[PDB]
Swiss-Prot record, chain C:
Residues 7-51 form a coiled coil. Changing D8N: In strain: Delta/B.1.617.2, Mu/B.1.621. Changing D176H: In strain: Alpha/B.1.1.7. Disulfide bonds join C90-C101, C140-C184. Changing Q129H: In strain: Kappa/B.1.617.1. The lineage of its organism: Viruses, Riboviria, Orthornavirae, Pisuviricota, Pisoniviricetes. Changing H159Y: In strain: Theta/P.3. This is Spike protein S2'. Glycans are attached at N132, N156, N192. Subunit of the fusion protein that is processed upon entry into the host cell. Mediates fusion of the virion and cellular membranes by functioning as a class I viral fusion protein. Contains a viral fusion peptide that is unmasked after S2 cleavage. This cleavage can occur at the cell membrane by host TMPRSS2 or during endocytosis by host CSTL. In either case, this triggers an extensive and irreversible conformational change that leads to fusion of the viral envelope with the cellular cytoplasmic membrane, releasing viral genomic RNA into the host cell cytoplasm.
């Protein structure tokens, strides 16, 4: 097997040789020479995602490694993973490119910020105050809805054999 | 043999009616899932793992796991869009006034609690407490909106629907005192405002008692949140089944790639590996299709939840039973893990009473019809009263309208009509 | 980027067909992916097995495409049912459902056709230029409480009027736009004012 051998707090019985998890995979082992219990963890693994602002605008990119601590590889640490190539900003804006756990990045260089929920607006409420409109505004909005997709038919014999 | 329900027979007769003389403010809950866990699968790790020659054998098979990655990314972005549509419906974060006095109504249970470090109302905290690793390329992506932002949207919607009625959902937010908003809501369902203004204390007490009973009932029944628990259960058990399928023989001589490689020469090792990888690809295809179907169902549920949020909350809905049993008044949303919980406040009549009714009153050869109510009679006199409440009033010429002579309608009765 | 949905439909179908076509050039683990080559290079005893593997792979791929098409068709049918509902309600009438036919109060809508879809033009009414006022629930007058029939009592500071909820149209409080119900002892917040009688 392959992994990271670490000290195990698990206590095998004297006849116990292997340890297994719920997934029925090896996780704890007993050393034949010196009778000690060791853990096995798979080597740090994760997917790679590329944040790009569009090739038309520029070419700079910031890469996010999913589910890895930043110490196991302009570096930022998020809940989604380790984010490199982008700088974290205390400011807040709307979400431009989603990342995860409330973090969104955009191009201004590349900046990563916590997404903004909306404009704060406290309304003055009191038990003897009402507000009545004095004017109006006719608004026109659009709404696009797909209806039918393209009808296709296959010829099995010619596709399979020909 | 199951019994459909208790026998009942309303004493229908030719000229009798029943009119409520009392009401009962009722609060009901409705639980709706919104999104499930966003998962992404890895092709090479799941199919065999760390064998480079295995990857060489796989890459010539086709671009199947490319399609699988595409489909799972589509599902994930669909989940995020579902949450956005359900919750992100207001572009401002409304904030409740510091002094929380709304004419006797007590919103402590649903308003955010600053004492808690999580900034959540007791109801949603109970919901969170009432709902309950090792991966081989099986990644779980985090949702874009954390729980705190969802609670923030819920608080904003609550503040908007308490301070400014339903006006904030159709333009700028216009403040209005809460008792007048409630009187407006009764006037929406055909009951005049005086009924509220003469019963404000009783209505407030009933509302508080109902909301307390709802909190207690959620605290007691553990099976109420099944519609949310089963989503997590389904996802977890499907993932566990997929993991278990990894160590399946699939007709090969052994279930271990390394053992097959070591103990067998390439001639038949190739055939064994082909069988194994085909079986694993088939299992992964089945899992992906199951995930797609579940995503479609959850998206339908999320669209229904968005419609409920838009109609029952942001306004008042006259659709029957769409926002709770009884006449709808207003509803309060509450956040929940992978879903949303509504608190429908509804008006329910009670304590009906028999009366003798007539279609019209003949007087001076003229037939007087009720303008907004219904003619009743306690036995001797005749009054006109609103349909949903017993509010007897002396019949006059301003709450009735004349139409034709009194020899054409059927069942007309003789009486006088006072003129002010 | 306004027409994202229809473009997504077209692109999804095009890329699905493209992937299905490109699936032909896959060996599926067979020594070749051409019928004639396997027919000419090998005799039936193992060419049969090779052809079996190839045809099984191709059928599996095509069936996967069919299932994907079925799921997408179900989604499109749901969207089309929603579109039919929107037409029948917002276009052929007026809707009291909030945000169903556009943000704000709905007035009327116009349809427009589009490739593989339909586009609506929701004409909606939006209030603006709000102004605060001091209001009372009811008016006590000679021991009788007067409630508005449809408006709400407002006051600029010295005089009281009744006006409709959605627009500021002040009116003199008379006995025809108010209805009496009981005395002014039980209503909480009632104020004092005269009620003109024509
Ligand atoms: C209500 O709003 C409309 C526009 O929203 C106002 O009409 C504008 O009035 C100004 C001042 O006379 C003109 O310069 C503009 O050209 C008008 N706009 C249009 C489109 O004609 C209207 O005056 C407002 N009414 C009140 C009472 O405030
Ligand atoms: C008052 O209404 C009740 C029902 O709301 C009537 O009770 C039923 O009346 C019918 C006809 O008189 C009887 O056949 C039923 O047996 C009655 N129900 C029961 C449970 O006994 C009642 O009769 C009405 N009374 C008046 C004076 O109208
Ligand atoms: C209308 O119904 C309400 C609630 O059912 C009644 O209020 C109750 O009245 C009784 C008798 O005075 C009290 O013992 C209860 O404590 C009251 N309940 C509450 C919640 O306050 C009310 O009396 C009924 N009115 C009529 C005319 O029947
Ligand atoms: C609104 O509801 C809250 C919660 O039920 C009430 O707070 C309770 O107050 C009583 C008496 O002061 C205490 O015995 C309870 O322990 C309180 N509840 C909790 C959860 O601590 C509150 O009094 C109600 N009314 C107002 C105006 O807030
Ligand atoms: C039906 O209601 C009317 C009006 O409430 C009653 O008429 C009055 O009833 C009160 C209470 O009994 C008496 O003090 C008045 O003298 C009655 N007025 C007249 C002109 O008679 C009537 O009694 C009620 N009928 C029944 C059968 O209850
Ligand atoms: C209501 O009153 C009218 C007039 O007072 C009644 O009409 C009379 O009915 C009697 C009985 O058949 C006739 O002899 C008269 O010729 C009728 N006069 C007119 C002008 O129509 C009527 O019958 C009464 N109906 C009820 C239900 O009391
Ligand atoms: C009507 O009056 C109220 C208070 O008299 C206004 O509420 C305040 O408005 C100012 C305007 O910028 C804000 O700075 C305050 O913060 C508001 N008060 C509170 C407690 O938040 C209200 O804005 C007025 N209405 C209009 C349309 O201007
Ligand atoms: C509130 O509105 C009333 C109605 O217009 C105002 O009363 C009039 O005010 C104008 C201008 O001040 C005078 O020319 C009229 O003579 C007033 N009419 C009456 C019957 O008094 C009143 O002034 C307004 N209040 C405020 C504070 O502006
Ligand atoms: C509205 O008018 C009534 C009667 O004109 C006022 O009632 C009087 O209130 C004073 C002050 O408490 C008492 O001394 C009188 O005995 C009351 N008379 C009656 C007939 O009720 C009432 O106060 C007025 N409203 C306000 C807000 O002042
Ligand atoms: C109105 O609210 C104020 C504080 O906002 C409170 O002191 C007062 O008692 C309330 N009065 C009524 C009639 O609600
Ligand atoms: C009213 O209905 C009863 C049956 O409940 C019937 O016997 C009677 O004839 C009806 N009266 C008229 C005027 O039709």
């Amino acid at each position: 097997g392959t992994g990271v051998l670490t000290e195990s707090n698990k206590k095998f019985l004297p006849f116990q040789q292997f340890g297994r998890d719920i997934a029925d995979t090896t996780d704890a082992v007993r050393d034949p020479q010196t009778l000690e219990i060791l853990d096995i963890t798979p080597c740090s693994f994760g997917g790679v995602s590329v944040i790009t602002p569009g090739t038309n605008t520029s070419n700079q990119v910031a890469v996010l490694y999913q589910g890895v601590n930043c110490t196991e590889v302009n570096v930022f640490q998020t809940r989604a993973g380790c984010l490199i190539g982008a700088e974290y900003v205390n400011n807040s804006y709307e979400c431009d490119i989603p990342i995860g756990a409330g973090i969104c990045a955009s191009y201004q260089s590349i900046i990563a910020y916590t997404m903004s929920l909306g404009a704060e607006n406290s309304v003055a409420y009191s038990n003897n105050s009402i507000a009545i409109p004095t004017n109006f505004t006719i608004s026109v909005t659009t709404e696009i809805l797909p209806v039918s997709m393209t009808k296709t038919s296959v010829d099995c014999t010619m596709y399979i054999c020909g | 043999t199951m019994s459909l329900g208790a026998e009942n027979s309303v004493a229908y007769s030719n000229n009798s009616i029943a009119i409520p003389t009392n009401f009962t403010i009722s609060v009901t809950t409705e639980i709706l899932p919104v999104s499930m866990t966003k998962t992404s699968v890895d092709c090479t790790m799941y199919i065999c793992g760390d064998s480079t020659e295995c990857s060489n054998l796989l890459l010539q098979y086709g671009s199947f796991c490319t399609q699988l990655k595409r489909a799972l990314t589509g599902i994930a972005v669909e989940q995020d869009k579902n949450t956005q549509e359900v919750f992100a419906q207001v572009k401002q974060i409304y904030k409740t006034p510091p002094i929380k006095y709304f004419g006797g109504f007590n919103f402590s249970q649903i308003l955010p609690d600053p004492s808690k470090p999580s900034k959540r109302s007791p109801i949603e905290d109970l919901l969170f407490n009432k709902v309950t690793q090792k991966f081989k390329g099986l990644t779980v992506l985090p949702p874009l909106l954390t729980d705190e932002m969802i609670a923030q949207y819920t608080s904003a919607l609550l503040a908007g629907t308490i301070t400014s009625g339903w006006t904030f959902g159709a333009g700028p937010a216009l403040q209005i005192p809460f008792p007048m908003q409630m009187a407006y809501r009764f006037n929406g369902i055909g009951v005049t405002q005086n009924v509220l203004y003469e019963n404000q204390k009783l209505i407030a007490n009933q509302f508080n008692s109902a909301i307390g009973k709802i909190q207690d009932s959620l605290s007691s029944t553990p099976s109420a949140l099944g519609k949310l628990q089963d989503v997590v259960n389904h996802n977890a058990q499907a993932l566990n089944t997929l993991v278990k399928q990894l160590s399946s023989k699939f007709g090969a001589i052994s279930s271990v790639l390394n053992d097959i490689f070591s103990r067998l020469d390439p001639p038949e090792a190739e055939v064994q590996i082909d069988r194994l990888i085909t079986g694993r690809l088939q299992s992964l295809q089945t899992y992906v299709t199951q995930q797609l179907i579940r995503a479609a169902e959850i998206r339908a549920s999320a669209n229904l939840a968005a419609t409920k949020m838009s109609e029952c909350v942001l306004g008042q809905s006259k659709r029957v039973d769409f926002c709770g049993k009884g006449y709808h008044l207003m509803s309060f949303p509450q956040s929940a893990p992978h879903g949303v919980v509504f608190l429908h406040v509804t008006y329910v009549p009670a304590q009906e009473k028999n009366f003798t009714t007539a279609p019209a009153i003949c007087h001076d050869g003229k037939a007087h019809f009720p303008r907004e109510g219904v003619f009743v009679s306690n036995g001797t006199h005749w009054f006109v009263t609103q349909r949903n409440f017993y509010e007897p009033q002396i019949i006059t010429t301003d709450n009735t309208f004349v139409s034709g002579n009194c020899d054409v309608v059927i069942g007309i009765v003789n009486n006088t009509v006072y003129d002010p």
